[PDB]
Nucleic acid binder design. Sequence first.
DNA 1: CGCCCTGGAGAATCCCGGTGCCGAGGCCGCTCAATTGGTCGTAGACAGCTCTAGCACCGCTTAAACGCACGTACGCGCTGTCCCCCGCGTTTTAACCGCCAAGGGGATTACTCCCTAGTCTCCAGGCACGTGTCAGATATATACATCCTGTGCA
Length: 49
Amino acid sequence: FRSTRWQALLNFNTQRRLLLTGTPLQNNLAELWSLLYFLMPQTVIDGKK
DNA sequence: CGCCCTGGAGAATCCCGGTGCCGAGGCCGCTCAATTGGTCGTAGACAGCTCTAGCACCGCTTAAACGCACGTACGCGCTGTCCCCCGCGTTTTAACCGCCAAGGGGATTACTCCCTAGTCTCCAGGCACGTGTCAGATATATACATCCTGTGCA
């Protein structure tokens, strides 16, 4: 989430997003919630609830 | 046989939109030195008076400025040479980010004493000034010292 290319790709003009990945990690919910953030920005910052 | 003038080509530039991005300025919260007045004592302008070097000048007395004539030699124009850095393509490194997060010491702000010096005061003495005296530079007697002249001679 703290990387620069994170916010670099967020402001582009698109009506849809498609993520192609092999597999994410099981634990470390921060990166899972991060991919969920970059999917669409409807998610709050609370992953610990 | 080889050079100015023309034409084709190429690319570097100018200028006009076109959309994302961020700090200039506005707005507010706040807050502290400017403002107003009074007090107080103090140097600056106004004469006052004085005194002293600048001013304008006159006339010897050399001394640089100048006009010119000659001249010769280096600044300059021209020419041949050659070599060194620019233009460009290919190689090689510096720096940014991603990972993966922690502290660290030094200027800042606030508080806190404490003691060196401003201010006032009086006592003393020391260097700017007047005068004594020798050093150096100056102008003049002087005892010979070198031509000139009577002058006597062989």
